[PDB]
């Protein structure tokens, strides 16, 4: 039986998001990609470098906004701009979100030598697609 | 997910207002803005290459959705 | 009511140097999503018509690169997972435009290049013969 | 297998296009190839194959000590190491191992 | 802070190979031709053979940059098949999908 | 009491507003700013596509909200002052060839990333028809033997591709140099040519 | 026959962005652009409008404090063209010799105390200090009043 | 008004600080997204459009003939013989290398010049005279 990226059936009490509820064979069919760049197009270079950066940004944001992320990050690249779109919860005070936004954008801009921006969308709770 | 009649009445009010907003974005007459124009405008503003059309962005009348 | 009274326009200086003449500009965009290329085509074509640039469009054949990988971390050789990368194309062909018009149009559509879309713009410039070649030395 | 006219015409085209002018065998032509490209060890894909793991690990360790990054994995390792001391399974001092 | 000692040895091999690349190139050019005297080429053979062993580029191994796996690596992403699939199957690799045809 | 989120500002938008002011530049989808009841997501059985709030699928899309037909027409009206007029005399391609017999091809590559470098951008291709050059019978015969496959008899075009210099301006100056030495050597007659 | 080629037009690197910016006006339903466009993060008063920006600026100061404290983590330059404004800053003098050229470095960094000490030691040794440099030392002392300028953290 | 300016005037601490007080009177937060792009462009963070893949990289102002004609650097080598034939292949390969600067290409040629000087005795045995 296949396992890769499959939330297995339970007793009907496990809430799953839309992304978590779709196995890998639905990528490009019912769900899009979590990162968009030109590295994987035919005749394009630097796919390896873009990949390492994406893996780091996901770990950085997970530990920088602990317990706040309500979904996976969406990483977008246009030119030399880097946009990070995250869906967060409404538990931390706004002051701490503004501190962490100013802190993370500045730190990542100096780390990867490019203008980085972080767009936050807050939700009252984790959006549930179904109960497995 | 049960849907009451007061909930559908609110969804129809939002679709009529959003339909005039969409016509305003595309610079078209809100009166003669049909569902075919809505589908065309949504495909341009929110381009989705997902193979399954049922998973693409949609803005239809509530009676055709719920 | 709270509208600006006078707006400062960016300074465009007319130089004394002659401008470049482009016989053709072949803008080839590549992406993974056909619908995104459709929206970009509509935007780029509408932008060219408003600026008075003659533009044609066609779709080169897509490319699909596929490769195979083992499915298990250990043994089970006869069980694989296959992946692919789809590269879709859209070619905008612009003709008979000066260097100043090409710089404005390209800057406008390059800044609005959606994420995940690359561009390869081939510019065919018109030049006159060098002065040394117009006649033999002897 | 070329006439004297064709041979002299090919030597003339070689001088204009910056090719090898003297008659050179296939072995000696490897010298031209060697200096016409970068060695494999000098290509960026080669010497920058790995990301600097020292930088990433050291940076995130510093941010954790600064209280700005929460390392769940490191917190897990710390808790396991703390409970092993209470259980008597502590790391010995160098030179003071069970074999002395 | 590299994955393991084997990755650390390959890191040092890539560093030393980069430092001696120009010298090895120049000495090799003296050996790869039939123009120079044999007496001079025999001396060049001894010179390049006396350079440090870890300067030889054939000793470099393309290992997975996240797990140090020495085989099953895809060169374009520098990832082992296992790590590549983990990222691809979660939709984190731009434009990569399962292939059916 | 906990912080209560404000209602979305779409409730304050008029149906006759100036939308380009809401999305002036490319920005990610924001449910609280887009006054459209748009839904996205493969629905569950007897369900509906998920609403826009907290919808990650709408966040993955490179939207064109900043490029509505109304905005594009206003943008292009301000960009007309930057354009120059194509010469009216050059009405057809045959007329351009008459006055401008040389064509120079170069390519620029737009990718995403921190580095704008691309080694393919240095290549220069120079095309010219030998009919445009002042070549007699002897010179045109000698020029065709010197260039070899760079000349196409069907089209009568000489294609010189240069890419051995790091920069494109260097490969362009080198392409013009090659065309100059080829032209002057074709007119020069050596003594060994008598043995043809 | 002769064709008249049009004259070239030139503009600054931001002229096109400025032309597009002239087409849009202020959005009256939105809060200023500096704030996060989100109903939970938007300021709901003039007090939060001031404190939210101070919290964001505070986070930027903490990031710069870390970048300047651990510069070796931020020295890998992958940008082309180079971006000088995204590199760490070095506020410490790198010339450890006692001479005039070493005093001028501590005057550019605005090290009031170190520059005075370097000046005293340089003077006691008997070496000549130019007049232009002595004036450049007064400009630093006379401006800050013989006090160290503000810093991020000591 | 002052007909001739003092272009070489020194930037004293009093003049550099008064210029910062004039940058504070027009200091306002960015009002929209265009102004953020304009600010990043002036600072140099954002790429300039239309895209130029060679932006900020001029190979030391070198001309094409400095990369392609390297025989001027072989004036120290013999004019005939195997060493001339060998160095003509080195310079031929270097003249086709777009990844090296003129400075690096000369470093290669300078290395061979010194190498053949240290091997003069060995070359004399083979009837080759290198200086
Ligand atoms: Mg199976
Ligand atoms: Mg091997």
From Swiss-Prot, chain B:
Coiled coil: none annotated. Disulfide bonds: none annotated. It is found in: Mitochondrion. It comes from the Eukaryota. Belongs to the universal ribosomal protein uS9 family. Component of the mitochondrial small ribosomal subunit (mt-SSU). Mature mammalian 55S mitochondrial ribosomes consist of a small (28S) and a large (39S) subunit. The 28S small subunit contains a 12S ribosomal RNA (12S mt-rRNA) and 30 different proteins. The 39S large subunit contains a 16S rRNA (16S mt-rRNA), a copy of mitochondrial valine transfer RNA (mt-tRNA(Val)), which plays an integral structural role, and 52 different proteins. This is Small ribosomal subunit protein uS9m. It comes from Homo sapiens.
From Swiss-Prot, chain C:
The chain holds residues 52 to 189 of 201 of the full protein. It comes from Homo sapiens (Human). GO terms for biological process: mitochondrial translation. It is found in: Mitochondrion. It comes from the Eukaryota. Keywords: Mitochondrion, Ribonucleoprotein, Ribosomal protein. GO terms for cellular component: mitochondrial inner membrane; mitochondrial matrix; mitochondrial small ribosomal subunit; mitochondrion. Belongs to the universal ribosomal protein uS10 family. Its main location: mitochondrion. This is Small ribosomal subunit protein uS10m. Component of the mitochondrial small ribosomal subunit (mt-SSU). Mature mammalian 55S mitochondrial ribosomes consist of a small (28S) and a large (39S) subunit. The 28S small subunit contains a 12S ribosomal RNA (12S mt-rRNA) and 30 different proteins. The 39S large subunit contains a 16S rRNA (16S mt-rRNA), a copy of mitochondrial valine transfer RNA (mt-tRNA(Val)), which plays an integral structural role, and 52 different proteins.
From Swiss-Prot, chain E:
Keywords: Disease variant, Mitochondrion, Primary mitochondrial disease, Ribonucleoprotein, Ribosomal protein. It is found in: Mitochondrion. GO terms for molecular function: RNA binding; structural constituent of ribosome. GO terms for biological process: mitochondrial translation; translation. It comes from the Eukaryota. The keyword tRNA processing does not apply. Its main location: mitochondrion. GO terms for cellular component: mitochondrial inner membrane; mitochondrial ribosome; mitochondrial small ribosomal subunit; mitochondrion; nuclear membrane. Belongs to the universal ribosomal protein uS14 family. It is linked to Combined oxidative phosphorylation deficiency 38: An autosomal recessive disorder due to mitochondrial dysfunction and characterized by perinatal hypertrophic cardiomyopathy, growth retardation, muscle hypotonia, elevated lactate, dysmorphy and intellectual disability. Component of the mitochondrial small ribosomal subunit (mt-SSU). Mature mammalian 55S mitochondrial ribosomes consist of a small (28S) and a large (39S) subunit. The 28S small subunit contains a 12S ribosomal RNA (12S mt-rRNA) and 30 different proteins. The 39S large subunit contains a 16S rRNA (16S mt-rRNA), a copy of mitochondrial valine transfer RNA (mt-tRNA(Val)), which plays an integral structural role, and 52 different proteins. Interacts with LIAT1. This is Small ribosomal subunit protein uS14m. It comes from Homo sapiens (Human). The gene is MRPS14. The chain holds residues 28 to 128 of 128 of the full protein.
Swiss-Prot record, chain G:
The modification N6-acetyllysine is found at residue 72. GO terms for cellular component: cytosol; mitochondrial inner membrane; mitochondrial matrix; mitochondrial small ribosomal subunit; mitochondrion; nucleoplasm; plasma membrane. Keywords: Acetylation, Mitochondrion, Primary mitochondrial disease, Repeat, Ribonucleoprotein, Ribosomal protein, RNA-binding, rRNA-binding, Transit peptide, Translation regulation. GO terms for biological process: mitochondrial translation; regulation of translation. The keyword Metal-binding does not apply. Abundant in testes, skeletal muscle and heart tissue. Disulfide bonds: none annotated. PPR repeats lie at residues 95-129, 130-154. GO terms for molecular function: ribosomal small subunit binding; RNA binding; rRNA binding. Its main location: mitochondrion. It comes from the Eukaryota. It is found in: Mitochondrion. Belongs to the mitochondrion-specific ribosomal protein mS39 family. Component of the mitochondrial small ribosomal subunit (mt-SSU). Mature mammalian 55S mitochondrial ribosomes consist of a small (28S) and a large (39S) subunit. The 28S small subunit contains a 12S ribosomal RNA (12S mt-rRNA) and 30 different proteins. The 39S large subunit contains a 16S rRNA (16S mt-rRNA), a copy of mitochondrial valine transfer RNA (mt-tRNA(Val)), which plays an integral structural role, and 52 different proteins. Associated with the 12S mitochondrial rRNA (12S mt-rRNA). Mitochondrial RNA-binding protein that has a role in mitochondrial translation. This is Small ribosomal subunit protein mS39. It comes from Homo sapiens. The gene is PTCD3.
């Amino acid at each position: 039986k296949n396992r890769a990226a499959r939330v297995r059936v339970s007793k009907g009490d496990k809430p799953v998001t839309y992304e978590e509820a779709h196995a890998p064979h639905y990528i490009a069919h019912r769900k899009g990609w979590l990162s968009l760049h030109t590295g994987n197009l035919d005749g394009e270079d630097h796919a390896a470098e873009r990949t390492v950066e994406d893996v780091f940004l996901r770990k950085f944001m997970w530990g920088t906004f602990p317990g706040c992320l309500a979904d996976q990050l969406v990483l977008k690249r246009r030119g030399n701009q880097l946009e990070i779109c995250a869906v967060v919860l409404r538990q931390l005070s706004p002051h701490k979100y503004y501190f962490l936004v100013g802190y993370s954008e500045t730190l990542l801009s100096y780390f990867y030598k490019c203008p980085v921006r972080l767009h936050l969308q807050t939700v009252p709770s984790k959006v549930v697609y179904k109960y497995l | 997910e049960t849907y009451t009649e007061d909930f559908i009445k609110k969804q129809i009010e939002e679709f009529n207002i959003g339909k005039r907003h969409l016509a305003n974005m595309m610079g078209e007459d809100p009166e003669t803005f049909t569902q075919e124009d809505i589908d065309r405008a949504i495909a341009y503003l929110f381009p989705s290459g997902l193979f399954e059309k049922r998973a693409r962005p949609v803005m239809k009348h509530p009676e055709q959705i719920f | 009511v709270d509208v600006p009274k006078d707006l400062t326009k960016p300074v465009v200086t007319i130089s004394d140097e002659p401008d470049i003449l482009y016989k053709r500009l072949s803008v080839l965009v590549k992406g993974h999503d056909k619908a995104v290329l459709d929206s970009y085509e509509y935007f780029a074509v509408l932008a060219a018509k408003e600026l008075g640039i003659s533009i044609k469009v066609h779709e080169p054949p897509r490319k699909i690169e596929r490769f195979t990988l083992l499915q298990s971390v250990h043994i089970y050789k006869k069980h694989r997972v296959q992946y692919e990368m789809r590269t879709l194309y859209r070619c905008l062909e612009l003709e008979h435009l000066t260097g100043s018009t090409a710089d404005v149009y390209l800057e406008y559509i390059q800044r609005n290049l959606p994420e995940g879309v690359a561009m390869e713009v081939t510019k065919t410039q018109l030049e006159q013969l060098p002065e040394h070649i117009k006649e033999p030395i002897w | 297998s070329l006439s004297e006219y064709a041979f002299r015409m090919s030597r003339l085209s070689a001088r204009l296009f910056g090719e090898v002018t003297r008659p050179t065998n296939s072995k000696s032509m490897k010298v031209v190839k060697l200096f016409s490209e970068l060695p494999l060890a000098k290509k960026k894909e080669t010497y920058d194959w790995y990301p600097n793991h020292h930088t990433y690990a050291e940076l995130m360790q510093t941010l954790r000590f600064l209280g700005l990054y929460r390392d769940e994995h490191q917190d897990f390792m710390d808790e396991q190491k703390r409970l092993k001391k209470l259980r008597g399974k502590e790391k010995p001092k160098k030179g003071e191992g069970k074999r002395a | 802070h590299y994955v393991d000692w084997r990755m650390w040895r390959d890191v040092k091999r890539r560093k030393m190979a980069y430092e001696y690349a120009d010298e090895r190139l120049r000495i090799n050019s003296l050996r790869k031709n039939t123009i120079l005297p044999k007496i001079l080429q025999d001396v060049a053979d001894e010179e390049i053979a006396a350079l440090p062993r870890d300067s030889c580029p054939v000793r470099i191994r393309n290992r997975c940059v996240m797990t140090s796996r020495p085989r099953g690596v895809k060169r374009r992403w520098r990832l082992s098949r296992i790590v590549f699939r983990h990222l691809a199957d979660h939709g984190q690799l731009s434009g990569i999908q399962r292939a059916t045809w | 009491p906990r912080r209560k989120a404000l209602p979305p500002r779409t409730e304050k938008m008029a149906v006759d507003q100036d939308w380009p002011s809401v999305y002036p530049v490319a920005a990610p989808f924001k449910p609280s700013a887009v006054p459209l009841p748009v839904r996205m997501g493969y629905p569950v059985k007897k369900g509906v596509p998920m609403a826009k709030e907290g919808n990650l699928e709408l966040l993955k899309i490179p939207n064109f909200l900043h490029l509505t037909p109304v905005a594009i027409k206003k943008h292009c009206e301000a960009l007309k002052d930057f354009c120059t007029e194509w010469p009216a005399a050059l009405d057809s391609d045959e007329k351009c060839e008459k006055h401008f017999p040389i064509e120079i091809d170069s390519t620029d590559y737009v990718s995403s990333g921190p580095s704008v470098r691309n080694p393919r951008a240095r290549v220069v291709v120079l095309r010219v028809k030998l009919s445009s050059l002042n070549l007699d019978d002897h010179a045109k015969k000698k020029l065709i033997k010197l260039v070899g496959e760079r000349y196409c008899k069907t089209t009568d075009v000489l294609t010189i591709k240069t890419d051995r210099c790091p920069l494109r301006r260097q490969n362009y100056d080198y392409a013009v140099y090659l065309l100059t030495v080829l032209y002057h050597e074709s007119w020069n007659t050596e003594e060994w040519e008598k043995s043809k | 026959e002769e064709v008249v080629i049009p004259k070239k037009k030139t503009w600054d690197k931001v002229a096109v962005l400025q032309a597009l910016a002239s087409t849009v006006n202020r959005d009256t339903t939105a809060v200023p652009y500096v704030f996060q466009d989100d109903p939970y993060l938007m300021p709901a008063s003039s007090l939060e409008s001031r404190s939210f920006l101070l919290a964001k600026k505070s986070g930027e100061n903490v990031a710069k404090f870390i970048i300047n404290s651990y510069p070796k983590y931020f020295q890998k330059d992958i940008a082309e063209p180079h971006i000088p404004c995204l590199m760490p800053e070095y506020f410490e003098p790198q010339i450890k010799d006692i001479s005039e050229a070493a005093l001028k470095e501590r005057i550019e960094l605005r090290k009031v105390k170190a520059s005075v000490d370097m000046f005293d030691q340089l003077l006691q040794a008997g070496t000549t200090v130019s007049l232009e440099t002595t004036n450049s030392l007064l400009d630093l002392l006379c401006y800050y009043g013989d006090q160290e300028p503000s810093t991020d953290y000591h | 008004t002052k007909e001739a300016p003092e272009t070489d005037t020194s930037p004293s601490l009093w003049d550099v600080e008064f210029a910062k007080q004039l940058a504070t009177v027009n200091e306002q937060p960015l009002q929209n997204g265009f102004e953020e792009l304009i600010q990043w462009t002036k600072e140099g963070k954002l790429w300039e459009f239309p895209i130029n893949n060679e932006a900020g990289f001029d190979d030391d102002g070198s001309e094409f003939h400095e990369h392609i004609f390297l025989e001027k650097h072989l004036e120290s080598f013999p004019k005939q013989g195997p060493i001339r034939h060998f160095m003509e292949l080195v310079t031929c390969g270097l003249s086709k290398n777009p990844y090296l600067s003129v400075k690096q290409k000369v470093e290669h040629i300078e290395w061979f010049r010194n190498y053949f000087n240290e091997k003069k005795d060995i070359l004399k045995e083979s009837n080759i005279q290198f200086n």
